[PDB]
Amino acid sequence: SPGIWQLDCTHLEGKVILVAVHVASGYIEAEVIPAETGQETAYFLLKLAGRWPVKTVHTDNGSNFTSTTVKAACWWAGIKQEDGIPYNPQSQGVIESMNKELKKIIGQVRDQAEHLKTAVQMAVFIHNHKRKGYSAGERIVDIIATDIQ
C-alpha cells in the first residue's frame, strides 16, 4: 500500500494533463504534455520513481499498459506495472472527483500564469498542501516513514 500509485490522464485547453496519484494518501504529481504517448508516460514514470518509492503503478489505459516503452521504463525503475481496472468501483468516482477539483483550482489560478504548465503546478501545490486535519503531503510522508521503520 505505501508503494501503490495510479496514473490518470485528463484534458484541458486542447492539451493533456498526466497525473500520478499516491492511492493511500491522495498526494499527486502532474505534468502538461502535448499528447499522451508511451514515450511521455515512460519519461514521467521514471521521474516519479526517482523521487518516491514507487512499487506498483496502475496504468490509466490499455495503450500505456501495452506500450513497450512504458514496460521498459517500469522494468528500468523496478516498477510492477498493473492494469487500472476499478475492481473497487469507488476508484472511478475518486478519480473523476479529483479531476474536477484540479480543473477548478487551475481555473482559480489560471490568470496568475502566462502558461498552462505553471497553473497546473500551482494546482499540484494547492492540492498537496490542502488541509482536509492532515494534508496529502503530510499523509504520504507519514505512511512511507512508518513503512521504512
Scan residues 84-123 and list those touching ligand NZL (CB under 6 A): 111-115, 117-118
One character per residue 9-48, x = contact with a copy of itself (rule: CB under 8 A)? --------------------x-------------x--xx-
Contact pick of 19, 21, 73, 124 for ligand NZL (by CB under 6 A):
73
- Least Å distance, CB 111 to ligand NZL, is 5
- Least Å distance, CB 49 to a copy of itself, is 6
Which secondary-structure segment (H or E) carries 119? helix 116-129
Residue 75, amino acid: W
Return the sign of the alpha-carbon dihedral for residues 103, 57, 43, 124: positive
Residue 117 touches a copy of itself, criterion: CB under 8 A:
yes
Q: How far is residue 19 CA from its own chain's centroid?
A: 3
Identify the DSSP state of 70: H
How many CB atoms sit inside 10 A of residue 12's CB? Answer: 17
Q: Residue 28 or residue 95: which is nearer to a copy of itself going by CB?
A: 28
Return the axis-axis angle of helices 136-148 and 116-129, rounded to nearest 10°. Answer: 60
- Least Å distance, CB 116 to ligand NZL, is 8
- Least Å distance, CB 113 to ligand NZL, is 4
